[PDB]
Amino acid sequence: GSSGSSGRLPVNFFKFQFRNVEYSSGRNKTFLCYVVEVQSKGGQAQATQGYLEDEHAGAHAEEAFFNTILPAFDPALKYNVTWYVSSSPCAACADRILKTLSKTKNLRLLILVSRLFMWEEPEVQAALKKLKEAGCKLRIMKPQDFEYIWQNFVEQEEGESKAFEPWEDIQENFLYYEEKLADILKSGPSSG
Numbered sequence: 001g002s003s004g005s006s007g008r009l010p011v012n013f014f015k016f017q018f019r020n021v022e023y024s025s026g027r028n029k030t031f032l033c034y035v036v037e038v039q040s041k042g043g044q045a046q047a048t049q050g051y052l053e054d055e056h057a058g059a060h061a062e063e064a065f066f067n068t069i070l071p072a073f074d075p076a077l078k079y080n081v082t083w084y085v086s087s088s089p090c091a092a093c094a095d096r097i098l099k100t101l102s103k104t105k106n107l108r109l110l111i112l113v114s115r116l117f118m119w120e121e122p123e124v125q126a127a128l129k130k131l132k133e134a135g136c137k138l139r140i141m142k143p144q145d146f147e148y149i150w151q152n153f154v155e156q157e158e159g160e161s162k163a164f165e166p167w168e169d170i171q172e173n174f175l176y177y178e179e180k181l182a183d184i185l186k187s188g189p190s191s192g
């Protein structure tokens, strides 16, 4: 939560904040965007938005969500949650997340990551699977999703208007991380 005024971040800052890239040494704190869309047999729907802050020692940005953002959900409505981040949830972050999907059906939780993290640990594999086995939705944060999160979850200068256009690689990077996220879901037999 830690809400205040707006539910997005100013480009002037995000530019030096979201810059946290593998090809860049020096990180401060990453923000996790969440979008929940509920519905009642067609008619009234409640849409929520905002970023969460990871706790140095307690609840990771991911948890902070269900901690205040989505505390409870009605089995009579269709909740549509969406997470837009760059770093994948740790074996613990994806935990409290799977425990929610294994109980809530009408609730559709979604999470994207432009880059896979700790996707080589024997603990994260079994911690990320449950998500795919519980009903969670995992997808490599495509270069097309950013735009929205850049024009919505991010405030643009006044009068001006830009657009995050990754001229470096749209697929090359996707396919790369794509095999990573899936890998955990697909493990080879031990015959060595």
Ligand SMILES: [Zn+2]
Binding pocket: 060, 062, 089, 090, 092, 093
């Ligand atoms: Zn975490």
